[PDB]
Amino acid sequence: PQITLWKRPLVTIRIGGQLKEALLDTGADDTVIEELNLPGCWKPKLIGGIXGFIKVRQYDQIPVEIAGHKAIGTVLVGPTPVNIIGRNLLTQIGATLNF
Amino acid sequence: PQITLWKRPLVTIRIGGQLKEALLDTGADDTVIEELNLPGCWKPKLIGGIXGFIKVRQYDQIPVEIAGHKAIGTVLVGPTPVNIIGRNLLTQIGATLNF
Numbered sequence: 001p002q003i004t005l006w007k008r009p010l011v012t013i014r015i016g017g018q019l020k021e022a023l024l025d026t027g028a029d030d031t032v033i034e035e036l037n038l039p040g041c042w043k044p045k046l047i048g049g050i051x052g053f054i055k056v057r058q059y060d061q062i063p064v065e066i067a068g069h070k071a072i073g074t075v076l077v078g079p080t081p082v083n084i085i086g087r088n089l090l091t092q093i094g095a096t097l098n099f
Numbered sequence: 100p101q102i103t104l105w106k107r108p109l110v111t112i113r114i115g116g117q118l119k120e121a122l123l124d125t126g127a128d129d130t131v132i133e134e135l136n137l138p139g140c141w142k143p144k145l146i147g148g149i150x151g152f153i154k155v156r157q158y159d160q161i162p163v164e165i166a167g168h169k170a171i172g173t174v175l176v177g178p179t180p181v182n183i184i185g186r187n188l189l190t191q192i193g194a195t196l197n198f
């Protein structure tokens with residue numbers, strides 16, 4: 001599909017069996033998901049943006065379906081105000097910017 | 100252009116007569132640029148990101164050329180980690196996400 005930018009580009013994702021809403025963020029290197037009990041092993045990480053840094057848990061090789069398109073990669077879990085799909089997964093679904 | 104996301108979507112912009120580099124950011128409502136002088140007078144605002152909140156100066160009706168495409172709109176100036184072009188100006192240049 002084509003997604004315009006008049007409103008926030010929020011889409012449905014499927015991760016760890018759950019459906020959630022997430023923002024497609026070309027300005028995010030990584031994918032950051034709100035809380036979420038999730039699997040069994042992780043590494044600590046800190047990530048920053050406007051503001052400052054938050055602490056997150058890095059999980060690897062997590063399947064994430066984005067608007068029906070399958071992806072699999074690293075997901076960071078922590079107290080983000082909005083679920084964010086970043087470039088690591090946008091590239092896997094063939095997402096481009098066009099103007 | 101069509102821009103893929105294997106690298107950060109950094110482009111050159113012209114603002115106030117000056118060249119800068121900025122990130123095309125579908126996850127940003129607003130356009131936020133590092134501390135600089137802009138003609139005109141400004142109002143204080145606060146904006147948020149992953150993380151927390153920062154204080155910025157809001158300038159309205161600022162011409163900005165983004166990879167050669169013209170926009171005229173709001174520019175927030177302050178201590179952002181990265182210059183970002185947000186949806187307020189991305190919509191003006193007709194930028195969409197596609198996959």
Ligand SMILES: CCCC[C@@H](CN[C@@H](CCCC)C(=O)N[C@@H](CCC(N)=O)C(=O)N[C@@H](CCCNC(N)=[NH2+])C(N)=O)NC(=O)[C@@H](NC(=O)[C@@H](NC(C)=O)[C@@H](C)O)[C@@H](C)CC
Pocket residue numbers: 008023025027028029030031032047048049050080081082084086124126127128129130131145146147148149179180181183185
């Ligand atoms: C400044 C750093 C680069 C741009 C920024 C854009 N992220 C969005 C995320 C959405 C909120 C969590 C953002 O900050 N958006 C702000 C930008 C400011 C603005 N005024 O537009 C925004 O829209 N803020 C709205 C509110 C958010 C609404 N979003 C939503 N409902 N989904 C506002 N008016 O305050 N990217 C990031 O924050 C990511 N940072 C990065 O990718 C890199 N970090 C740095 C410091 O460059 C990397 C080295 O880690 C985070 C997610 C880690 C992967």
